[PDB]
Amino acid sequence: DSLSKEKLLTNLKLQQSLLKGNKVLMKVFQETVINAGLPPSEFWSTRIPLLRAFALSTSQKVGPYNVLSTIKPVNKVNVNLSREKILNIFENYPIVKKAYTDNVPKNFKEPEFWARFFSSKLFRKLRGEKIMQNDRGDVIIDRYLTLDQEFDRKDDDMLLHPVKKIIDLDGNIQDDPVVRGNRPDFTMQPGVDINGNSDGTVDILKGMNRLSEKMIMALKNEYNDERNELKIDDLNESYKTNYAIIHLKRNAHEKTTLKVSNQQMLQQLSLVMDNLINKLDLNQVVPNNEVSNKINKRVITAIKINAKQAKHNLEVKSTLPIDLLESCRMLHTTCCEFLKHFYIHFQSGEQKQASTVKKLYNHLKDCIEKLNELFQDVLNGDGESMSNTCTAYLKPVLNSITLATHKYDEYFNEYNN
Amino acid sequence: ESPSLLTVIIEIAPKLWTTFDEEGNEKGSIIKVLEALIVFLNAHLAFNSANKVAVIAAYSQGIKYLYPESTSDLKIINSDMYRRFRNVDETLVEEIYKLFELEKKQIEQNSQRSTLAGAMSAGLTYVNRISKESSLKSRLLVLTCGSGSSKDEIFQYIPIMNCIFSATKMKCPIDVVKIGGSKESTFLQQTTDATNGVYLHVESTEGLIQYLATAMFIDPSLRPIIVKPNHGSVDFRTSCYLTGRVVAVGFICSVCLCVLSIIPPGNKCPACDSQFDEHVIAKLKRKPVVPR
Amino acid sequence: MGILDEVWKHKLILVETPDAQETSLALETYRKACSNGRGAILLSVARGKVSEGIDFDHQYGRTVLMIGIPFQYTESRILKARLEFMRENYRIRENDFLSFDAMRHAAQCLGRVLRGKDDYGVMVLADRRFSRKRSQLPKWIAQGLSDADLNLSTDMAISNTKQFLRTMAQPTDPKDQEGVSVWSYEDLIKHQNSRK
Amino acid sequence: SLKHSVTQYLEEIPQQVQNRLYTSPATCLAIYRILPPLAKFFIMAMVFNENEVPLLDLDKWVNSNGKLQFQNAIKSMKSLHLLIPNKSSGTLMINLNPTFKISLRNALTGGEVQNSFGVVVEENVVSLDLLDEYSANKWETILHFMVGTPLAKIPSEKVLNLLKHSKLMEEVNSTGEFKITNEGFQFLLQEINSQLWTLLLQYLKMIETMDLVDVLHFIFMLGALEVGKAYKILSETQRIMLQDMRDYGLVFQKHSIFYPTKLALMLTSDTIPDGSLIVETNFKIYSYSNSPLQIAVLSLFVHLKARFVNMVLGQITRESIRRALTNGITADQIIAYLETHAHPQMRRLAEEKLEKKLELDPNCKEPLQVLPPTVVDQIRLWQLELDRVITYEGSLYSDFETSQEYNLLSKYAQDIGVLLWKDDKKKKFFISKEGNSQVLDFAKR
Amino acid sequence: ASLVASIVEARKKRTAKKNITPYQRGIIRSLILTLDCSEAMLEKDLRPNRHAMIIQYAIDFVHEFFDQNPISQMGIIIMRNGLAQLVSQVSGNPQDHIDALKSIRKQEPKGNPSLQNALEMARGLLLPVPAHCTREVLIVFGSLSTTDPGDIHQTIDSLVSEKIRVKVLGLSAQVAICKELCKATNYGDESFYKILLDETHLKELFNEAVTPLPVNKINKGFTLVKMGFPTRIFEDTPTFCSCHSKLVYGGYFCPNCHSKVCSLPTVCPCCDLMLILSTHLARSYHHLMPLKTFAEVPTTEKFRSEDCFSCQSRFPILTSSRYRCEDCKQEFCVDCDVFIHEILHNCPGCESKPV
Ligand SMILES: [Zn+2]
Ligand SMILES: [Zn+2]
Ligand SMILES: [Zn+2]
Ligand SMILES: [Zn+2]
Ligand SMILES: [Zn+2]
């Protein structure tokens, strides 16, 4: 289905779809392929989960439901039609879909059609309403009555299937074919009208049963056992988890990249217990104001250093021209994209990736030179008034990029040389 | 604003104190520290009228609820001083002498484990107790003698991390005072940085009064309007399990989650015995493929 | 009234057809509907063809709406002659025998809920006249029938049913039934020795 | 404004008199207790080194987020003459008061205190049985005397004269009776240390030379004192006003050994609840509190029914409301009592309604009153319906010409506090008849 | 007579927690909470309505899950009007999903549920997920039925085949299909289809769902994983970030490819490698090192001590409230027992006792 990497890369229409959904994706994609000419497959190669998420979001569909039961008759009536529910009616009733498609594009209008439909007795029959000759219906819609009837016959023919004997009431009533007793009660048998004909409640009940069967066979779509069926689980062994416990052997390496004696510590301990029982003065704790002054110097130096650390506690406010700010952000963004793709190629590790690595290396070099030329532009645009800040802002991505270039050169010298 | 529940843990150990005073010459430096802390608690309980103080000492064999007295009479200090200050100071010097006499009594047995983490945890429980009673600021103070032999912080690491997480839940900064030869104590520095605590290491026992009076006075009533004075920064990295060196980029077990700077021998976990996948580790060992 | 349209929005509705074959397809539909859990409702006569050999269990037997007293048709000369003959023979009260047959049919209707002890279900009696018939009712059936349950309305019926569902939605410790309801082989041995 | 009032009074105290106050460690300890946290930190830092600092070092240390609070602290520090900031070497060279510095240092070290913490006898006894009981007795007598419910034990003649002179609980000589002023009800609303501090501020204001600094230092050490011990009877002015505050019931003196009760501790610092009242739309009182003092003060503004163990019941009548109003007692004072006597369940319900109305609309189109207006605004509507007018009496200048008399001499009159009313467009503004100090002088220009 | 009822209730409670095991439990998690916002949750039957409380509880669940297990990504898909709507991709930042849920606050829950569509697109979202990550879904449900387009059993089979588990927190009562889902997905276990009894029980259930789950021995995936600790810088100059492309004063630096990021624990956007701190991995060590229960000593026997070992308070006196750590042979009070067993994760008695 539409789930492989190849399928997701193939769906150019879906790619354009979420493209048109976003705006920064036009920005990024335009710079990536329109401006830089990157292979758009490798563009989308990162965004594969996003593509699949968009596809699966677009791909779901609802389940069937009794749309005619949700239809209410609502003096006068005003049509308040919902197109999704109109198509729901179409899908649930292909007869109604057919009656739409041979009349509205031929004879009259859609709201006129639906007014005729709500007027029609075919609507009442398809809904849970007993048909009545007092009702006149709509003649145009009610011409489809026998067509819907033979649809019902064909659908019932499709719905017929053999039954399991374990639950077969037909086999149950065919237990004794020579039962000769008495005629059962009118009360518990299906009653009829005065002239022997039925009222049709059996028809409406078999119709709603047909609706149920249609729903369950819609469930039963494309998208022996009695031994298991008759198991009595209540007298069986309880399930126990096979979860594995874990122990932990403990032997850690010592931290890598004079010794005191009991006599000496005991001597000092005796002496300091003597001093402890001897004396203790709070007033002697006051310092000499000179080594204390050096303490003041050290403390104040620490305060100054950490205060300058705290002095640099939406992005930050900047005094850049807004266009050059956007341009440099754009260049940073596409350089980051190039760098990520180059790392994807490099950490892949194949000889098939070699020309890709070389070409992305060329693109990184081009981005470097374009960064330098941008630096020349902000040079002769500022006289290095804040072109220094421009260079420093674009610095770290450039450092990482050129570090990657050095890594590529080093591995080239490692393998080839 | 509110009474700040003061939490002070003093790590007392003759193995450290003897080492420090033999390395230097300031005998009674621990006494100087105790007097300085006496003035510190005086300054704190004079800063606020109810900012109650929890004082606990961890000796070599365990810990002790110093302040206050247990739930179950000489005066060295002066009679002219304040009533509450005098009561607390007399109680603490009595408790300190009792603990030191006990330490002299049972000196000769050996326990090589630091009790700092357990003391910190018990103090945090008491912080929960006090805060649950009756709104109170939580601020935890540790005093350590770092001149002793850094034996093994490895078993201390895990409960220290647990204490960090608990204090993070409890909004309690963990402020560290270290006196020792070693400038750096990585786990304590990480503890201060994560808990928004204060790290400080010096050597001289003199001037600690000015040191921890000036710097070590930040209360949660005024924490955001005071810059922290810490200068060190920590990478929050750990040494490897089988080589014992810190790693920047490496490997961890999917089960035990211990850092592996290299491939374990036998491709099995050195912590929880999980045998791994040879194709996985070969892909990890893969060199990049470069054109000729 | 269109009440069935409202009923459509929650479960399917299945009606006992006079055709046993269509009824079989209908019960298969109900079976599959409770299998997928979208939910369905069966409509069958108390003496109807479903009631004489089909059981319902653990999703099929969950709640039953028995409708009134299933009395037979009153004005049968055949029934009256039966009543006269059986009264002449064994001195049988006629109305009492009618109530007997009605309650026995009701019991046959309601007996198809509890397959195993793990199952659970709720029973309703939708007639005023049932209150005098607990003494008639089978003993194990009526032992769960409490005296407060003898005359209830829709509101506390709903509340008690919701609370019953909440109750049956909970797990149970095996210790509370390991020796009183479920018996091991050793439990049976111990019981046999206790009998001895 | 207790610390504000005391700080204002000490700023009124001149520099060398302040420095005399900064001489003794007990006074320095009490004043350090008064200082805000920032200045407290500053002085405890600088007190242990004789290194003066410039202002620039402190400014670099100070995070600018709380710079206003820093400005308040240093403004108090300078205006109390506790600082000596001089622009030495062009830099405002910061210097603490040195007598304050050394006396704080000695107090902290436990060094030379000269028994400023107290000339001790240390003959401790039980205080709950003699000191607390006599203290509660004398304070109950003076408290019900302030209430106005009859009580035989009249206060001292010194405090009686101070009440007669002062505008607190007016002993109106035409009536011969102590009468509840609005200031008297402010005193009733006040916290106990607030009442003590107002009393001592008034007594210090009225008392003259009796050495003022002796009274100051003695008051500060008396606040610094501890409960339940005998002490030496010192200055004689201190001793005689010590006997005065003995007659107030503050100290339990056996005519030389004296035993300070818990009132010194409360003067030093503070230490479905009690004092929590459930309001009712039917104006019924469901107090979670009871005392005969509570009934005595509730008799002024509440119609009550009976007294039970914690359940004090009653019903607030408009007769009780207007009984409060006619005494000059402010409805703002009344709601000060009411909003200090709220209950947990009803305030939780009020906060639930507030959070419900927050999401609907920010204004809610409702009057701003957090306490539930079903009962609370009924008084507040009665509060607005109580005053509901503005009266101007006396002189009035009318029919002005153009706004050079409004934006130049009446806009300036906002800065000097002489007008009672201001209307530029009416070309009239009202002043009191006696408030013509600087009104008929520049308005002629 | 309330203490006897409390004692027997504590006994019946502790019978479940008698067995404490050091099972291997998943750390690299993959948790999905789908929400239905239908007509059923419009019931005000629980105050104020089911929609509001599940919103609030989901806020709490997001906070707790990210606090305890920051080494997972969180995705939320809402169910509404016969459609399942993705609102939250799996991400390391909880704040994104917090904002999405805040959007879900103001909108109106309506429609009918479709677990088929919901679980299908949850499967599709869970498709590009690495092997070590434990794919598991929490599902809240208030209906007693489910309108669906097609079969659920094929979806069940596919989910079982793709090694993803589920846990259903139903509202009203048990639904047999949900029981079937929980049983078949969960190796026959019935410990996953849970029904609340009140909002407090719902709170407890959410807290239970916070915890990591044990894994099975047969579901063996024991391997290594590449990891990298980055380094934080605090620069004077603002610098462009790689992720959000904007100027940043500080930021961590990539250990491998030396780029910079804005948040942790996150994977690299550039060298594409996961970056954490040792705190994050040690955060679950209480799960890795569980704590034994503490036993009250009986009131009849002689007592080692009469006051609490840890909090230092007197033990109250009919029964004896002295919860003993047998690993350290010290008895403790109930408050300390609660704190050490839940908040703390170490026994200070065992810290003092040398091994
Ligand atoms: Zn491992
Ligand atoms: Zn960023
Ligand atoms: Zn990287
Ligand atoms: Zn305890
Ligand atoms: Zn233990």
Neighbours, chain A (3 or more CB pairs < 8 A): B, C, D, E
Residue D211 contacts residue D101 (beta carbons within 8 Å) = no
- What is the identity of the amino acid at D134? Y
Residues in chain E, overall count: 355
CB D163 within 8 A of CB D171: yes
- Reduced to 3 states (helix: H, G, I; strand: E, B; else coil), residue B51 is coil
Q: Residue B10's closest CA among B59, B53, B45?
A: B59
DSSP state of D201: H
Q: How many CA atoms lie within 13 A of C128 on its CB side?
A: 0
**Contacts with B128 (C-beta within 8 Å, 6 or more apart), sequence order:** B170, E339, E343
Angle (CA) B273 B277 B283, round 5°: 135
How was this structure obtained? cryo-EM
Q: Tell me phi and psi for residue E72, to 5 degrees.
A: -140, 165
Q: Are C127 and C169 in contact (CB under 8 A)?
A: no
Q: Is residue B251 part of a domain?
A: no
How many Å apart are CA B7 and CA B55, to the nearest integer? 6
CA of B28, closest CA in chain A: separation in Å? Answer: 6
DSSP three-state, residue C60: coil
What is the number of other CB atoms lying within 10 angstroms of the CB of residue E60? 14
Q: Domain containing B173: what range? A: 4-216
Q: Which residue has the tokens 């603990």?
A: B99
**Residue E265 preceded by cis peptide, ω within 30:** yes
Whole-number Cα distances in Å, C87 to C90, C95, C96, C101, D230: 6, 11, 11, 15, 112
Q: Measure in Å the smallest separation between the Cα of A3 and chain D Cα atoms.
A: 45
* Residues B13/B59, Cβ–Cβ less than 8 Å: yes
What is the end-to-end Cα distance of chain B in Å, rounded? 72
Report residue D118 as tokens: 């107290």
Which residues on D lie below 8 Å from A302 (Cβ)? none
Q: Are D395 and D433 in contact (CB under 8 A)?
A: yes
Q: Dihedral of CA A45/A47/A53/A56: which sign?
A: negative
| E185, E159 contact by CB (below 8 A) | yes
Measure CA of the first residue to CA of the last residue in chain C; give whole Å.
Answer: 66
Query: Domain residues of chain C, as ranges?
Result: 1-176
Are the beta carbons of B121 and E348 separated by less than 8 Å? yes
Closest by Cα among E40, E113, E120 to C37: E113
A326 touches chain E (CB under 8 A): no
What crossing angle do the helices spanning E153-161 and E115-126 adopt, rounded to 10°? Answer: 20
Domain presence at residue B90: yes
Task: Give the Å distances, CA to CA, from A64 to C15, C143, E119, E128, E146.
Answer: 21, 45, 18, 31, 11
Answer yes or no: is B250 within a domain: no
Beta strands E134-141; E83-91: pairing state: unpaired
Q: What would the two tokens of residue E334 be?
A: 């109930």
CB D315 within 8 A of CB D284: yes
* Angle of CA points E207, E208, E213, to nearest 5°: 130
Inter-chain CB proximity B219 and D37 less than 8 Å: yes
Q: What is the dihedral of CA A219, A220, A226, A228, to 10 degrees?
A: -60
- Reading phi first (left if > 0) and then psi (alpha if -120 to 50, else beta), residue D348 is in alpha
* Gaps in chain E after residue (C–N beyond 2.5 Å): 317
Other beta carbons less than 10 A from residue B224's beta carbon: 11
Closest CA to B10 of B111, B108, B123: B123
Distances (CA, A) of B243 to A220, A254, B258, B261, B274: 61, 8, 12, 7, 19
B241 chain-E contacts, CB cut-off 8 A: none
Classify B142 as helix, strand or coil. Answer: strand
Please answer whether residues A266 and A274 qualify as being in contact, where contact means their C-beta atoms are separated by less than 8 angstroms: no
Block residue for tokens 């550039």: E270
Distance in angstroms (rounded) separating the CA atoms of residues A147 and E98: 55
Give the integer Cα–Cα distance in Å for B206 and E353: 35
E227/B249 CB distance under 8 A: yes
Enter the tokens of residue D392. 């101007």
Residue C48's Cβ-side half-sphere holds a number of Cα atoms within 13 Å equal to 19
Among E82, E127, E189, select the one facing A63 at the smallest CB separation: E82
What is the number of other CB atoms lying within 10 angstroms of the CB of residue D443? 15
Q: Do A303 and D110 touch (CB under 8 A)?
A: no
Other C-beta atoms lying within 10 Å of the C-beta of residue D7: 18
- Note whether B touches E: 3 CB pairs or more under 8 A: yes
Query: What are the residues whose beta carbons fall under 8 Å from the beta carbon of D385, sequence distance 6 or more?
Result: none
Cα D434 to Cα D366, D393, D394, D395, D438: the distances in Å are 41, 10, 8, 9, 11
* Fold assignment, C1-176: Rossmann fold (3.40.50)
Span from the CA of A42 to the centroid of ligand 3 (angstroms): 19
Q: How far apart are the first and last CA of chain A?
A: 47
Across A80-91, b (16+ Cβ under 10 Å) vs e yields eeeeeebebbbe
* Alpha carbon distance B38, B46 (integer Å): 12
User: What does the alpha-carbon distance between residue C153 and residue D291 come to, in Å, rounded to a whole number?
Assistant: 54
| Residue among D32, D49, D63 whose CB faces B226 most closely | D63
Cα atoms in the Cβ-side hemisphere of radius 13 Å centred on A342: 26
CA distance C14 to C27: 8
Q: What is the DSSP letter of C176?
A: G
CA of C93 to the centre of ligand 4 (A): 76
CATH number at residue B40: 3.40.50.410
Which of the ligands is closest to the CA of residue A403?
3
Identify which of D5, D7, D65, D58 has the alpha carbon closest to the alpha carbon of residue D36.
Answer: D7
Task: Nearest by CB to B222, from D32, D37, D109: name it.
Answer: D37
Q: What are phi and psi of D119, to 5 degrees?
A: -70, 100
With 0-12 CB in 10 A as exposed, 13-18 as middle and 19+ as buried, what is C26?
A: buried
> D51 in contact with A at a CB cutoff of 8 Å?
yes
Q: Per residue in A390-407, is it b (16+ CB within 10 Å) or e — as a string?
A: bbebbebbbebbeebeee
User: How far apart, in whole angstroms, are the C-alpha atoms of residue B161 and residue D331?
Assistant: 57
- Say how far apart CA A94 and CA A100 lie, in whole Å: 10
The closest of D1, D28, D61, D329 to D188, measured between CA atoms, is: D329
Residue B260 lies in a domain: no
* Owner of token pair 């260049």: A331
B/e letters for D391-422, b = 16+ CB within 10 Å, e = fewer, are eeeeeebeebeeeebbeebbeebeeeebbbee
In a domain? residue B156: yes
- CB proximity C171 to E under 8 Å: yes
3-state SS class at D133: helix
- Residue B257 included in any domain: no
Question: Nearest 5 degrees, angle CA A301-CA A302-CA A307?
Answer: 100
Strands B174-179 and B199-202: parallel
Q: How far apart are CA A399 and CA A393, in angstroms?
A: 11
B204/A260 CB distance under 8 A: no
Chains E and A touch (3+ CB pairs under 8 A): yes
* Gap between the Cα atoms of D331 and D322, Å rounded: 10
How many CB atoms sit inside 10 A of residue E21's CB?
A: 12
Q: Which residues pair with E137 in a beta bridge?
A: E32, E166
Q: How far, in Å, from the CA of E312 to the mean position of ligand 4?
A: 6
Q: Which residues contact B132 (CB under 8 A, 6 or more apart)?
A: E335
The answer to whether A414 contacts B214, with C-beta atoms less than 8 Å apart, is no
Instruction: State the distance from the centre of ligand 5 to the C-alpha of E342, rounded, in angstroms.
Output: 15
- For residues D259 and D131, the answer to whether their CB atoms sit within 8 Å is yes
Nearest one of E256, E343, D410, D255 to A346, comparing CA atoms: E256
- Asked if A267 reaches chain D (Cβ–Cβ under 8 Å), the answer is no
Distance CA C89, CA C66 (A): 33
In 3-state terms, what secondary structure has residue D258? strand
**CB atoms near residue C19 (< 10 Å):** 16
Per-residue burial over C70-79, b if 16 or more Cβ lie within 10 Å, else e, is: beeeeeeeeb
3-state secondary structure chain A: CCCCHHHHHHCHHHHHHHHHHCCHHHHHHHHHHHHCCCCHHHHHHHCHHHHHHHHHHHHCCCCCCCHHHHCCCCCCCCCCCCHHHHHHHHHHCHHHHHHHHCCCCCCCCHHHHHHHHHHCHHHHHHCCCCCCCCCCCCHHHHCCHHHHHHHHHHHHHHHCCCCCCCCCHHHHHCCCCCCCCCCCCCCCCCCCCCCCCCCCHHHHHHHHHHHHHHHHHHHCCCCCHHHHHCCCHHHCCCCCCCECECCCCCCCCCCCCCCCCHHHHHHHHHHHHHHHHHCCCCHHHCCCCCHHHHHHHHHHHHHHHHHHHHCCCCCCCCCCCHHHHHHHHHHHHHHHHHHHHHHHHHHHCCCCCHHHHHHHHHHHHHHHHHHHHHHHHHHHHHCCCCHHHHHHHHHHHHHHHHHHHHHHHHHHHHHCC
Question: How far apart are the CA of E92 and the centre of ligand 2, in A?
Answer: 13
| CA separation, residue E211 to residues B245, E31, E135, E204, E341 (Å) | 32, 11, 14, 11, 15
Q: Give residues 43 to 72 of C whose Cβ lies within 8 Å of E.
A: 58-59
Q: How far apart are the first and last CA of chain E?
A: 44
Note whether E107 and E78 are within 8 A (CB): no
Alpha-carbon gap: B41 to the closest alpha carbon of chain D (Å): 11
Residue E305, chain B, CB below 8 Å: the answer is no
Chains that touch C (3 or more CB pairs under 8 A): A, E
- Enumerate long-range contacts of B43-46, CB under 8 Å, 24 or more apart: B43/B213, B43/B217, B43/D44, B43/D108, B44/B4, B44/B6, B45/B84, B45/B85, B45/B88, B46/B85, B46/D29, B46/D32, B46/D33
Partner residues linked to B250 by β-bridges: E227
Residue C41 phi/psi, 5-degree rounding, is -130, 130
Rounded to whole angstroms, how far apart are CA atoms E240 and D420?
Answer: 61
Long-range CB contacts (within 8 A, 24+) of C164-170: C164/C120, C164/C122, C165/E172, C165/E173, C165/E174, C166/E173, C166/E195, C166/E197, C168/C120, C168/E173, C168/E174, C169/E170, C169/E173, C169/E174, C169/E195, C170/E195, C170/E197
Structurally, chain B folds into a number of domains equal to 1
Amino acid type, C114:
L
- The contacts found for E123-126 with CB under 8 angstroms, 24 or more apart, are E123/E155, E123/E158, E123/E159, E123/E162, E123/E164, E124/A3, E124/A52, E124/A53, E124/A56, E125/A53, E125/A56, E125/E32, E125/E75, E125/E77, E125/E86, E125/E89, E125/E90, E126/E30, E126/E32, E126/E162, E126/E164
Angle at B158 between CA B227 and CA B275, to 5 degrees: 130
**Is the separation of the CB atoms in B258 and B270 below 8 Å?**
yes
Residue B55 neighbours by CB distance under 10 Å: 23
How far, CA to CA in Å, does A192 sit from each of A167, A187, A202, A375, D200?
29, 11, 10, 97, 107
Q: What are phi and psi of A261, to 5 degrees?
A: -120, 150
State the Rg of chain C over Cα.
21
DSSP one-letter string for B144-213: EETTS-----HHHHHHHHHHHHHHHHHT--EEEEEESS-S--HHHHHHHHHTT--EEEE--STTHHHHHH
CA distances from E287 to A231, B263, E212 (A): 39, 26, 8
Q: What is the DSSP letter of D438?
A: S
Q: How many CB pairs under 8 A join B and D?
A: 54
Compute and round to an integer the Cα radius of gyration of chain D: 27
> What would the two tokens of residue A148 be?
């819907």
Q: For residue A121, which amino acid is it? A: K
Tokens standing for residue A253: 């390496």
Those residues with Cβ within 8 angstroms of residue D176's Cβ, 6 or more apart along the chain or in another chain: none
User: Helix/strand/coil (H, E, C) string of chain E?
Assistant: CHHHHHHHHHHHHHCCCCCCCCECECCCEEEEEEEECCCHHHCCCCCCCHHHHHHHHHHHHHHHHHHHCCCCEEEEEEEECCEEEEEEEEECCHHHHHHHHHHHHHCCCCCCCCHHHHHHHHHHHHCCCCCCCEEEEEEEECCCCCCCCCCCHHHHHHHHHCCCEEEEEECCCCCHHHHHHHHHHCCCCCCCEEECCCHHHHHHHHHHHHCCCECECCCCCCCEEEEECCEECCCCCCEECCCCCCEECCCEECCCCCCECCCCCEECCCCCCEECCHHHHHCCHHHHCCCCCCEECCCCCCCCCCECCCCCCECCCCCCCCEEECCCCEEECHHHHHHHHHHCCCCHHHHHCCC
Q: Indicate the SS3 state at residue D285.
A: strand
Quote the minimal CA–CA distance from B119 to chain A in Å.
23
E263 within 8 A of A338, measured Cβ to Cβ: no
Tell me whether A399 touches chain E (CB under 8 Å): yes
Tell me how far apart the alpha carbons of residues B277 and B260 are, in angstroms, rounded to a whole number: 15
Chains touching E (at least 3 CB pairs under 8 A) are A, B, C
Radius of gyration in angstroms for the set of CA atoms belonging to chain B, rounded to a whole number: 23
Helices D212-224 & D236-247, crossing angle to 10 degrees? 60
- Contact state of C52 with A185 under an 8 Å Cβ cutoff: no
CB contact under 8 Å between A209 and C72, yes or no, is no
